[PDB]
Amino acid sequence: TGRFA
Amino acid sequence: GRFA
Amino acid sequence: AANDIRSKKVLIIGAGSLGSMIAENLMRIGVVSQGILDADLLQTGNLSRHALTMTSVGHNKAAALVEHLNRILPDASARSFSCAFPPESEVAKNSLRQYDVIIDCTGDDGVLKSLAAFDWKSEKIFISLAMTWRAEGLFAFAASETSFPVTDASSRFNASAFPARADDVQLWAAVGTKFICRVVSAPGRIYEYFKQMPDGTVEKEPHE
Amino acid sequence: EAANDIRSKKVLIIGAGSLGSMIAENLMRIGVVSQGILDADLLQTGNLSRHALTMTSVGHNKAAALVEHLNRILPDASARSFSCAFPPESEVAKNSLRQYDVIIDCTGDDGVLKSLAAFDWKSEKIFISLAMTWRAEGLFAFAASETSFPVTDASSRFNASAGAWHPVFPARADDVQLWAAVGTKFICRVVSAPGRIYEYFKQMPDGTVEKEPHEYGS
Numbered sequence A: 001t002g003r004f005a
Numbered sequence B: 001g002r003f004a
Numbered sequence C: 001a002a003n004d005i006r007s008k009k010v011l012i013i014g015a016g017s018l019g020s021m022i023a024e025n026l027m028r029i030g031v032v033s034q035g036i037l038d039a040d041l042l043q044t045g046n047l048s049r050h051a052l053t054m055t056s057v058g059h060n061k062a063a064a065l066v067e068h069l070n071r072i073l074p075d076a077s078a079r080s081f082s083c084a085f086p087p088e089s090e091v092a093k094n095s096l097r098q099y100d101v102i103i104d105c106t107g108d109d110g111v112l113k114s115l116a117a118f119d120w121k122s123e124k125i126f127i128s129l130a131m132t133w134r135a136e137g138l139f140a141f142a143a144s145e146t147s148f149p150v151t152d153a154s155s156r157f158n159a160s161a162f163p164a165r166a167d168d169v170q171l172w173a174a175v176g177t178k179f180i181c182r183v184v185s186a187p188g189r190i191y192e193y194f195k196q197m198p199d200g201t202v203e204k205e206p207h208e
Numbered sequence D: 001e002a003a004n005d006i007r008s009k010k011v012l013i014i015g016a017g018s019l020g021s022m023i024a025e026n027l028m029r030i031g032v033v034s035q036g037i038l039d040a041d042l043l044q045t046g047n048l049s050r051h052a053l054t055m056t057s058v059g060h061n062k063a064a065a066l067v068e069h070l071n072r073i074l075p076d077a078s079a080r081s082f083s084c085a086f087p088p089e090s091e092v093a094k095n096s097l098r099q100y101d102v103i104i105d106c107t108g109d110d111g112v113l114k115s116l117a118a119f120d121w122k123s124e125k126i127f128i129s130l131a132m133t134w135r136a137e138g139l140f141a142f143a144a145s146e147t148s149f150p151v152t153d154a155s156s157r158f159n160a161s162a163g164a165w166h167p168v169f170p171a172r173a174d175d176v177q178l179w180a181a182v183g184t185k186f187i188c189r190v191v192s193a194p195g196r197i198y199e200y201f202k203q204m205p206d207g208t209v210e211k212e213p214h215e216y217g218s
């Protein structure tokens, strides 16, 4: 799961 | 009635 | 670019809670040519739901917001109007008649009829955005006329009709900046009333 | 309940990036004055399209600059900066991090999850991981109240869920602001009722926001 913060 |  | 707000001059009447955050959002997406019309000073109680900080308290809301907006991006070109709408000088009225998209964020029924009474001397994209008193909803009206349709906007507001926190107003600022961008991309008579739930989800009911 | 009020809790935020900076500002404006901000990276001009800070902070550590901004919001703001990556190397720094009650991860980095699970917090904490999808079409929102962070379960939940205004387009300021508002509401709900929680939000083209599991509305 790619996650961008 | 409206609040900006 | 004709459908792109980044190339449009955008006047924002009202540098308060919703209007300060909307202005900042627009500046960060690339809307560099902005006007900011407000006559009141920033107060300490405003900061709980505002884009600026204590360093701007006591300064005119428009001037302070423009100083902040011009520090966001190198090409930012925000301009301040420390008067109430409409202006008194005829130079000032011509300055406001250079803006393509006039965005009312005051929540004042007097500003609505002032917009209708002002002579814009050209077609404009008018957008009125306001919240309910506890930020449970957002009134979002839009039009593309040579004169602001005050009767119809008032009708759609009346038909749709704890203390608002920073997360309540920021949510509606985001929703409204997305509404502003959908309107400039496809101009027309649009009205939409949104509603926030306790978990931040949003529902919509557009007018037909 | 005052004992479940985030405004009285010390709140570390690991990651002073797009989402973390806007959440930290939201929390400061509601009254969370005791915040820790942990980030080793420097702010750059490309960050400003999606950040709480301005050009005046370009070239400064992201945590230190964010803490400067936060301490200008309220007279009693007591934000403190940690200009390093997690975990710290110093023992003093580790002890300082072990004083925070709510540990909020806004890095989007799986390694940070693994580091959280490995760190010795020495007491029960309210852990909260928050990150967006690659085009900010959704928001992963995990929470837990344990002495050690549950990395495996969080990863499982994330994998199971896995004009420019349209959510499919790249992320803009308003996309990150929308998910910073939804995550600040998630952070306040978690602290009010601590426990194992997971929710997946979704931005829609018509401007509405949906959640899985569904709770409010039709």
Ligand SMILES: *OP(=O)(O)OC[C@H]1O[C@@H](n2cnc3c(N)ncnc32)[C@H](O)[C@@H]1O
Pocket: A004, A005, D014, D015, D016, D017, D018, D019, D038, D039, D040, D041, D062, D084, D085, D086, D087, D106, D107, D108, D109, D112
């Ligand atoms: O801008 P963005 O969405 O990529 O935000 C991510 C932020 O998270 C920071 N980060 C990454 N890894 C760490 C660790 N280990 N500790 C603290 N912060 C960390 C990035 O530097 C970025 O600001």
Ligand SMILES: *OP(=O)(O)OC[C@H]1O[C@@H](n2cnc3c(N)ncnc32)[C@H](O)[C@@H]1O
Pocket: B003, B004, C013, C014, C015, C016, C017, C018, C019, C037, C038, C039, C040, C061, C083, C084, C085, C086, C105, C106, C107, C108, C111
């Ligand atoms: O805080 P708030 O939600 O009431 O924000 C309203 C903002 O709108 C400004 N306002 C009110 N009336 C006018 C006129 N006529 N022209 C320009 N701005 C105006 C308030 O000062 C506040 O910033």
Ligand SMILES: [Mg+2]
Pocket: D041, D042, D043, D044
């Ligand atoms: Mg960088």
